[PDB]
Amino acid sequence: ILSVDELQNYGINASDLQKLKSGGIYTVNTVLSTTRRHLCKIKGLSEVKVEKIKEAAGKIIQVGFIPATVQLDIRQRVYSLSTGSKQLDSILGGGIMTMSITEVFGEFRCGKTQMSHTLCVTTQLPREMGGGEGKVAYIDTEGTFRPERIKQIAEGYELDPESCLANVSYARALNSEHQMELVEQLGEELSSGDYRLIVVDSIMANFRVDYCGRGELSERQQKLNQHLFKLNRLAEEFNVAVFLTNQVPIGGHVLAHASATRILLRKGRGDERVAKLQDSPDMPEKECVYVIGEKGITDSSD
Amino acid sequence: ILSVDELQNYGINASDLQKLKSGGIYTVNTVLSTTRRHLCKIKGLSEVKVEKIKEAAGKIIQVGFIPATVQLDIRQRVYSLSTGSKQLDSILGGGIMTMSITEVFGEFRCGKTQMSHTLCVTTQLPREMGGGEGKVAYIDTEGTFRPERIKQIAEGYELDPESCLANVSYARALNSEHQMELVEQLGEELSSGDYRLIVVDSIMANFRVDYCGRGELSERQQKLNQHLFKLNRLAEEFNVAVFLTNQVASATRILLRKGRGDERVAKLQDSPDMPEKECVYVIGEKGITDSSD
Amino acid sequence: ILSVDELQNYGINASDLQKLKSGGIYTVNTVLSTTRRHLCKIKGLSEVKVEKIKEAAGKIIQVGFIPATVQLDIRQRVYSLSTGSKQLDSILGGGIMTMSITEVFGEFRCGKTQMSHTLCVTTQLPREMGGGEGKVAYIDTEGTFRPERIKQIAEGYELDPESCLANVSYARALNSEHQMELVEQLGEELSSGDYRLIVVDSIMANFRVDYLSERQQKLNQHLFKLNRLAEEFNVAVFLTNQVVLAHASATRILLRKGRGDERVAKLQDSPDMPEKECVYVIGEKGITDSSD
Amino acid sequence: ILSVDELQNYGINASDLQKLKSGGIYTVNTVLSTTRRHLCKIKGLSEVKVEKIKEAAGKIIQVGFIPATVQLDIRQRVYSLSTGSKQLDSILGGGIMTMSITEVFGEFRCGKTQMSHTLCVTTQLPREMGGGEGKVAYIDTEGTFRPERIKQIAEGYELDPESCLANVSYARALNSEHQMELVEQLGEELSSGDYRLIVVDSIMANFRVDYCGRGELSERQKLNQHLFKLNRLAEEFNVAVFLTNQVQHVLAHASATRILLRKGRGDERVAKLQDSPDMPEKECVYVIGEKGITDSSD
Amino acid sequence: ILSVDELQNYGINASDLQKLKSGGIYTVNTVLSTTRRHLCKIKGLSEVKVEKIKEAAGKIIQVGFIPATVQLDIRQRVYSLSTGSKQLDSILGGGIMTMSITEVFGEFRCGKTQMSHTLCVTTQLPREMGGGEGKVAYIDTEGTFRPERIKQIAEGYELDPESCLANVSYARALNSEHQMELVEQLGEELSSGDYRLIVVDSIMANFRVDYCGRGELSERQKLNQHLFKLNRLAEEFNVAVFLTNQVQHVLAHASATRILLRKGRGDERVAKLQDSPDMPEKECVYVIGEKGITDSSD
Amino acid sequence: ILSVDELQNYGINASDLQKLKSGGIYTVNTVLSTTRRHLCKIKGLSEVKVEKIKEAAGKIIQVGFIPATVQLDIRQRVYSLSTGSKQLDSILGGGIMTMSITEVFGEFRCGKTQMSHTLCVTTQLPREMGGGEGKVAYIDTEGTFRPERIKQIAEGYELDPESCLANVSYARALNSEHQMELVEQLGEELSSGDYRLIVVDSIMANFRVDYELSERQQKLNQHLFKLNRLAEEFNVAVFLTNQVVLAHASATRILLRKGRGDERVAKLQDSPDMPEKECVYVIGEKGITDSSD
Ligand SMILES: Nc1ncnc2c1ncn2[C@@H]1O[C@H](COP(=O)(O)OP(=O)(O)O)[C@@H](O)[C@H]1O
Ligand SMILES: Nc1ncnc2c1ncn2[C@@H]1O[C@H](COP(=O)(O)OP(=O)(O)O)[C@@H](O)[C@H]1O
Ligand SMILES: Nc1ncnc2c1ncn2[C@@H]1O[C@H](COP(=O)(O)OP(=O)(O)O)[C@@H](O)[C@H]1O
Ligand SMILES: [Mg+2]
Numbered sequence A: 001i002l003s004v005d006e007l008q009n010y011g012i013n014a015s016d017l018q019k020l021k022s023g024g025i026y027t028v029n030t031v032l033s034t035t036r037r038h039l040c041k042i043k044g045l046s047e048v049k050v051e052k053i054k055e056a057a058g059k060i061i062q063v064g065f066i067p068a069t070v071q072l073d074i075r076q077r078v079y080s081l082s083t084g085s086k087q088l089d090s091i092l093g094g095g096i097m098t099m100s101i102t103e104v105f106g107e108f109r110c111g112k113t114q115m116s117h118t119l120c121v122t123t124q125l126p127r128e129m130g131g132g133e134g135k136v137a138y139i140d141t142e143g144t145f146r147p148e149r150i151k152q153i154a155e156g157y158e159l160d161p162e163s164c165l166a167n168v169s170y171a172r173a174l175n176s177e178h179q180m181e182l183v184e185q186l187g188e189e190l191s192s193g194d195y196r197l198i199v200v201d202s203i204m205a206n207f208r209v210d211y212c213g214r215g216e217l218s219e220r221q222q223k224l225n226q227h228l229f230k231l232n233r234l235a236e237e238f239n240v241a242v243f244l245t246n247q248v249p250i251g252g253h254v255l256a257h258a259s260a261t262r263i264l265l266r267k268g269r270g271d272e273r274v275a276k277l278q279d280s281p282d283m284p285e286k287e288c289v290y291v292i293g294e295k296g297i298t299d300s301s302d
Numbered sequence B: 001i002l003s004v005d006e007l008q009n010y011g012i013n014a015s016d017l018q019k020l021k022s023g024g025i026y027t028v029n030t031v032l033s034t035t036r037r038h039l040c041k042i043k044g045l046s047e048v049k050v051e052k053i054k055e056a057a058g059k060i061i062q063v064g065f066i067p068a069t070v071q072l073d074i075r076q077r078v079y080s081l082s083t084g085s086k087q088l089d090s091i092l093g094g095g096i097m098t099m100s101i102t103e104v105f106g107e108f109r110c111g112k113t114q115m116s117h118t119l120c121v122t123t124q125l126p127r128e129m130g131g132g133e134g135k136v137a138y139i140d141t142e143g144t145f146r147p148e149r150i151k152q153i154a155e156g157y158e159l160d161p162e163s164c165l166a167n168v169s170y171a172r173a174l175n176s177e178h179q180m181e182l183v184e185q186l187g188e189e190l191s192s193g194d195y196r197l198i199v200v201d202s203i204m205a206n207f208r209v210d211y212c213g214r215g216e217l218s219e220r221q222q223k224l225n226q227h228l229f230k231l232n233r234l235a236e237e238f239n240v241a242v243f244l245t246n247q248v249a250s251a252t253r254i255l256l257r258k259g260r261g262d263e264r265v266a267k268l269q270d271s272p273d274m275p276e277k278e279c280v281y282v283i284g285e286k287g288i289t290d291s292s293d
Numbered sequence C: 001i002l003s004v005d006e007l008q009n010y011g012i013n014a015s016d017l018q019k020l021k022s023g024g025i026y027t028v029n030t031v032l033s034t035t036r037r038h039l040c041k042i043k044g045l046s047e048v049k050v051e052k053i054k055e056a057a058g059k060i061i062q063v064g065f066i067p068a069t070v071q072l073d074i075r076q077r078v079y080s081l082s083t084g085s086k087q088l089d090s091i092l093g094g095g096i097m098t099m100s101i102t103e104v105f106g107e108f109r110c111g112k113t114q115m116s117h118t119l120c121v122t123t124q125l126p127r128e129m130g131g132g133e134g135k136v137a138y139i140d141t142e143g144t145f146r147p148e149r150i151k152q153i154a155e156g157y158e159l160d161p162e163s164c165l166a167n168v169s170y171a172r173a174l175n176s177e178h179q180m181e182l183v184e185q186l187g188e189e190l191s192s193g194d195y196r197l198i199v200v201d202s203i204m205a206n207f208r209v210d211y212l213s214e215r216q217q218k219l220n221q222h223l224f225k226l227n228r229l230a231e232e233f234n235v236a237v238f239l240t241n242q243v244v245l246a247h248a249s250a251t252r253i254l255l256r257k258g259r260g261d262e263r264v265a266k267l268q269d270s271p272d273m274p275e276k277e278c279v280y281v282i283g284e285k286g287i288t289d290s291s292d
Numbered sequence D, E: 001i002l003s004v005d006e007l008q009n010y011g012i013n014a015s016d017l018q019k020l021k022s023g024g025i026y027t028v029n030t031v032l033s034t035t036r037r038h039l040c041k042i043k044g045l046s047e048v049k050v051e052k053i054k055e056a057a058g059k060i061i062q063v064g065f066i067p068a069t070v071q072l073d074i075r076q077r078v079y080s081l082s083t084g085s086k087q088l089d090s091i092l093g094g095g096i097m098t099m100s101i102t103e104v105f106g107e108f109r110c111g112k113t114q115m116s117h118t119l120c121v122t123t124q125l126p127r128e129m130g131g132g133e134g135k136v137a138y139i140d141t142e143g144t145f146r147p148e149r150i151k152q153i154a155e156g157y158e159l160d161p162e163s164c165l166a167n168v169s170y171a172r173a174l175n176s177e178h179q180m181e182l183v184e185q186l187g188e189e190l191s192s193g194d195y196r197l198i199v200v201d202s203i204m205a206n207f208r209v210d211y212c213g214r215g216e217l218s219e220r221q222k223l224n225q226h227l228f229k230l231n232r233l234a235e236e237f238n239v240a241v242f243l244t245n246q247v248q249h250v251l252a253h254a255s256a257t258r259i260l261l262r263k264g265r266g267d268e269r270v271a272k273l274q275d276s277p278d279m280p281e282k283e284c285v286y287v288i289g290e291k292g293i294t295d296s297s298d
Numbered sequence F: 001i002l003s004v005d006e007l008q009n010y011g012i013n014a015s016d017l018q019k020l021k022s023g024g025i026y027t028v029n030t031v032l033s034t035t036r037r038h039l040c041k042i043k044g045l046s047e048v049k050v051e052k053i054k055e056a057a058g059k060i061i062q063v064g065f066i067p068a069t070v071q072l073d074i075r076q077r078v079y080s081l082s083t084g085s086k087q088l089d090s091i092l093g094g095g096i097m098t099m100s101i102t103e104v105f106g107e108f109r110c111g112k113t114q115m116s117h118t119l120c121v122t123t124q125l126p127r128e129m130g131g132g133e134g135k136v137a138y139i140d141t142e143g144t145f146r147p148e149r150i151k152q153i154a155e156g157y158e159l160d161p162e163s164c165l166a167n168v169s170y171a172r173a174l175n176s177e178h179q180m181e182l183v184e185q186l187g188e189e190l191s192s193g194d195y196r197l198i199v200v201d202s203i204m205a206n207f208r209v210d211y212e213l214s215e216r217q218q219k220l221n222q223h224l225f226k227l228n229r230l231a232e233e234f235n236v237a238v239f240l241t242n243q244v245v246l247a248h249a250s251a252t253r254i255l256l257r258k259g260r261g262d263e264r265v266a267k268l269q270d271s272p273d274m275p276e277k278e279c280v281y282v283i284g285e286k287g288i289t290d291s292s293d
């Protein structure tokens, strides 16, 4: 990831960089992504500075027409974060992928928060065993974050548990607007390049709580759009997997279109649970079997 | 617990604070957890002043990304409210957890009211003795409260019956609605911060009789739901444990069944910390205990 | 127990009092225990009107978290009415308990009616010897009520017979609907607050004849109304039953025929006391101990 | 006893009264007793009509809580029908009491039919000597109703025998359903208020024959309905119900009081009060003489 | 395709040619297409210079009235790019046709991106079997372009995956302004004449987010200019512009031919030729197999 | 039709014919129609030459008030170009009229291009069948011309298709200025006199993107004036199509609309002489045909 600071040599004053920081512009990728119209309304930014900023930013990263071979090289750098269950890793083609949006959904009691915790613990695993070796941002919209569970699963994975606990980040989304403010503020944390996973558990809870009654659902939806859009944008810029959790599916066409990958969970026999991929741009629908044990989400044979 | 007093020296007028008091906001955590649109809905509050109130609340304590190590340090303050049964304490990690909602259901004469009384007495116990050394609030819907039982249990644990009987604030939840605003007006009581337990027994007794007939169950549900929602949030910022009793949203769920003779069986259904287990208990002179006890 | 008339002092027109009394609301306690939704169902009352009447009633008597010492004090006024036998009263903690539903059941002629008469006479006794010093409302469904038995037992306890008879308010329930309307009208007569006991003998002798799901729902409504009335009016509602209803009754006792006139009373269920059994007998003095 | 015709002046036309009488309702007490649902089953009656009928009946005779002194005054209207033997009258507290069911049972020849004849002849006696001074409805399920015995006992009680015979309403029940049809047509002739006793001798003779096999024992809830109807008329007409039964849980709970009849030494007979709502168990000695049941010493 | 570099020897210096390159004019056909008023807007270009450039370009290729046999010969140079399913090719009369705008639209998951990848590979096919034997210009507006998918489909089409990927030129459009800047800069790369297809998947993705509120619908004429530029590129460069649209008027006018995609039972998919310049409305069955869009039978 | 070559015997040298031909004048009719001033603006033609040419050419045709005695004979020289639909020709009086500009307009997919293609073939037919037995000039501004469609329609009419394409001269109008150049030097091709139709499809396509309105209509009216005179002295029909000041130039106007289902409506919006009427047409393999046919 390349931030906005390293622009000092290209002819950008510190005042303009600070204005970009205040506007939520923390990296070159979001400099390119943000249009000149949206760049203009940034506080303190003129209608002539945004252009020269744009040509300055265009020089660092080659933004143009390229053969698909270098595009394959680009997509080689996304990480297939393991979801704990090896069969669930295989069915998704490696598991949750960074730079893309993946949603898990189902009834209550189906094992979603446990999937989130398993991702939080395995995301700090290095390459070649399903980890990304990158930090995690957890948004707790349900107040259900249990750090001792993360330490437990870390002991299960034979890693220094205190390190795993310090690496994972955490926020308690007290309301939908607090969650929105948090996802908007992720700029200066994701800019450092240490974070390679955002997990929201759940995504819709505060939206359903704050917005009640049919007279504001559309409002919710469009806010959701922005929220979801930002998440997707945050996925594409900093190369982080966005892992949503939702109850039931619900979210409508808005969430169906926003979510690139979708998984449904349902109960099986005892602690055995069964999952169904429902939508994905790479793989067809199939089935998988998992269990919730002392080390989070694993295979039944584990 | 950080009440709304610390807004005054941060740039908030006394009239604004009193309006917040009328608005149901009595702690810094509560105002930090209230939506701007929700905060301006309070009568006498304009949308311009709620913003400055919000950052005034935000300066005293930060809300956002905090390393999970610090979140674990914060979680370390929670106290396990001992049920009185050492084995049942073990199967729940020391008892009822704070910051969360506990629900108990089963057939009648299964000890749920006895469980409520035992928690109501053990809450006064100091730390490392299964209690938070804090006060109790009892919200009675079935009218089965017996202060004589609290005195008896305080005798059983070698506690002053008058002292434990004194640290219990009691109120009858006559109807479902009255239950709603009796839960709503807990801000004043918990703003002292001494409280560690709130008990409602039973949760569904008032709602089941206030809304009868399949013509309104749906709306009845959401009523109950919003009630539950408040309870859930009412459990978090105040570091209290809410014990809900049910008759046959809740973070913990327990089933109680009648066993052979005078013993009963306890089973766990839902928990965000430990898997389900099984246990046995009796109702001795000190309340719910182990059979050998 | 305070009538809603003090509510008149709070800027409230007499039409409100008449409407509340017509709707079955006869005391500030009933106002506090009645919901806005059901109070609006009363003809002539609007939503804001019900809101203001409720807040005025709450201004009369506060309903909120009080220290439990005050709850013990208000619990001290709870009356323990002797059943006539010292053993059963001891295993009951001092007799029957007000603010609660006591149900006794057993075989045919286990002494349920005789023990109902003993409860009818003992409640008129003052405190310090297991009484309640007040009147008793006797709802009879099988036709087994006998004033002469009450007179004889009252003479046994060495008190005026005719005053004892005039001290009991009796009603015969002909069928289930009459049984319900009687307990509905109990509020008006109990608003005076003199009564202490509500005997129903027996609860479902008319429900069985008049009818299942509708019968069960109607009986559930009946028992709920009885329980609410017992809670609000500081009276013990004592039920008898023959051989669902356990849900409403706070305390349950089973009666078994023994050898000859000897009878066994078993505490099958209680909210407070443990499972204990005892022996009693029906004699010239009513319900007495086996040695007595 | 106030008939339903007393509702005519309260705002009810004769058509509704006739429709009520068609359903077996001849007394305002029966109007109050019958639930609104059962009154809806009456042909030609609507829910509004049922409600207004009930409201009108409530006003003429009040139902509500009253002081128990008034209830003692009401219970003072209960007759004590003489059994014929003074000691058994003392044991029973005055004899056979109306408003309740009295059952007598025992072996054959104990004198159950003779007891029924004695009651049918002594009910006609005035008060203050054990009589109810009213008519008696005899139902014979055995063919043993002997008017000559009634005449003989009436002559024994120095009373006109012809009036005694004319004063008793005799019916012969051929089978069980005929016996029922009799008991729920009894409402018409009981409305006159002249009857104080309903003798059913016996209650089991027709049922033990008309129903045979374990399949029909469950059906004989029909007997429950029969006995409930008898108790209802006993309550709402102030008449004693004197049932007769033989020996070889229904009647145990249906009958308010019970008596065993047993054979003694020689012609002596013993009557044991097995159950009674208010009296304790005792035993009496009696004989069956020319005047029916009589004290053994006399 | 003859680049404007053919004007250097006709009496135009290199500076004017370089300015033409900077002005977006890269072909003599592009010179003839555009009006002199548009050339005079270019910095450093005067009216006389513009006129002499137009005069010189007119001599290279004639623009006048010719017999329709010659125009039939010219129309014989269109490319019939197979869609992937032979049935839909028969419905289209040869599949995709160049010098035209083909717009396929449908709901999410319908298979517009899969068909775009099938097109990226099948255009590279030599002709006589449904191909175009040329490069592809892929513009992605949603991040859904999978090079591995093209690799796998090309392997299904027994081709070298590495060269097949090297031919297609990919561009990720972050926002609408970038998407446009890309489409006008497409003129420089298209001047080689190697390309046969320009995929835009999807056309309206950046517009739904870069413009919000009823105020900016009027500005979202800029999209019309975008589509006009795409149409001009397709007309001048003998390339087929294949658009993708998401469903929930002027856009319909811009596209020469349209296809609508619908989901059927199971994985069966249906394609309807909603609008076509010279074909009737029909229905086709297709599936997304290991080699992209293909017939349901195979 | 007689070209300016026959003027040479009047006393005019061949040294001035080429420059006047470069000025857009190729026939004596164009000489008479044009004014002295417009000949003066032509480079190389002096005022003496301007007056000499016109005075020499004017001794073949007179100018004055005209009773209709002889014009009816000249009026019957007008051809009736069949549209392909008997009903549509009937409401149009037998088909598209020459000596005038016919304009059809409609929204997207109304069949205007198909109508132009059909009219390219029906002209090939002789008279007494709705044709003109002559060439067709197609000016295309949207790129929707298809010689294979002409093939199909000519096959439909039982005609030689290769000859039919041989008799259709095509020209693609890239922009408005090239469109006007095509129109202005179209006279040199029509000087042969064998043409019977001129198709411009569509007339407004180039101007809507090239153009500021004042100059747009200023140029458009000149374009329409030139088209109208071409149609006038060349005995050809100018067929224009429009997508939905033009109405004044076009003598006949037709609206094509999509009706219920696949039915299409051809309303006669405006005609110089015949009343507004109604028709239904279908685009078949033969081009434009009647709904029943
Ligand atoms: N510390 C633990 N060790 C083992 N299992 C646990 C632990 N904590 C929770 N679980 C199990 O994880 C299961 C699913 O939890 P969770 O993911 O929170 O469900 P949800 O899908 O509702 O979020 C629970 O049934 C519980 O038994
Ligand atoms: N990598 C793949 N390999 C095979 N089939 C695929 C692949 N990706 C998607 N599909 C199929 O195509 C469908 C989605 O096609 P896509 O072009 O992404 O739809 P759209 O563009 O209309 O949203 C999937 O449901 C699946 O059937
Ligand atoms: N060869 C053909 N045979 C029959 N109908 C056709 C043929 N070609 C096109 N069409 C019909 O003609 C219509 C196209 O009309 P078009 O000429 O494009 O009008 P416009 O130019 O006003 O858009 C299409 O809807 C199509 O159904
Ligand atoms: Mg969860």
Ligand SMILES: [Mg+2]
Pocket (backbone or CB within 6 Å): E112, E113, E144, E201
């Ligand atoms: Mg797509």
Ligand SMILES: [Mg+2]
Pocket (backbone or CB within 6 Å): F112, F113, F142, F144, F201
């Ligand atoms: Mg067209």
